[PDB]
């Protein structure tokens, strides 16, 4: 499935997401949407094996396994395309201890390049919360 703006954002505060680890919900939504466009199939190949997965685009060389990227060690134990259904329990309880283990939010190249230090809230302007 793929998101509505304002629709995501209150999916994952139901979720727990809202200041998780002090990020504020509009750096999840705003990353979301540059990381996946709000659609939770989403899927994508950097070069060595690994694969990324759903809405928050997790790696498989550590988050998730998906029987063949061989580096991995599989810390969210779950399977990759979990992560790829309309219910984003998964990813949001994995994207937890991504985002708890210690680079933040930063361990998202793009919230990173495109969110970090810009006003995230006007992700969330408009959304009944």
Same mark, same amino acid.
């Given at each position: 499935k793929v998101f509505g703006?304002?629709?995501?954002?209150?999916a994952m505060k139901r979720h727990g997401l809202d200041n998780y680890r002090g990020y504020s919900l509009?750096?999840?939504?705003? /990353?979301?949407?540059?990381? @996946?466009?709000?659609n939770t199939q989403? #899927?994508?190949?950097?070069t060595d094996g690994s694969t990324d997965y +759903?809405?928050? &685009?997790?790696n498989s060389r550590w988050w998730c396994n998906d029987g063949r990227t061989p580096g991995s060690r599989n810390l969210c =134990?779950?399977?990759? @395309? /979990?992560?790829? !259904? !309309?219910?984003?329990?998964? !990813?949001?309880?994995?994207?937890?201890?991504?985002? !708890?283990? +210690?680079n933040g939010? =930063? /361990?998202?190249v793009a919230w990173r390049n495109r969110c970090?230090? #810009?006003?995230? &809230? /006007?992700?969330?302007?408009?959304?009944?919360?």
């Open positions: 703006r304002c629709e995501l954002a209150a509009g750096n999840w939504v705003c /990353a979301a949407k540059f990381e @996946s466009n709000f989403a #899927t994508n190949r950097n +759903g809405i928050l &685009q997790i =134990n779950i399977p990759c @395309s /979990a992560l790829l !259904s !309309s219910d984003i329990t998964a !990813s949001v309880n994995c994207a937890k201890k991504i985002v !708890s283990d +210690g939010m =930063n /361990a998202w970090k230090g #810009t006003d995230v &809230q /006007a992700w969330i302007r408009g959304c009944r919360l």
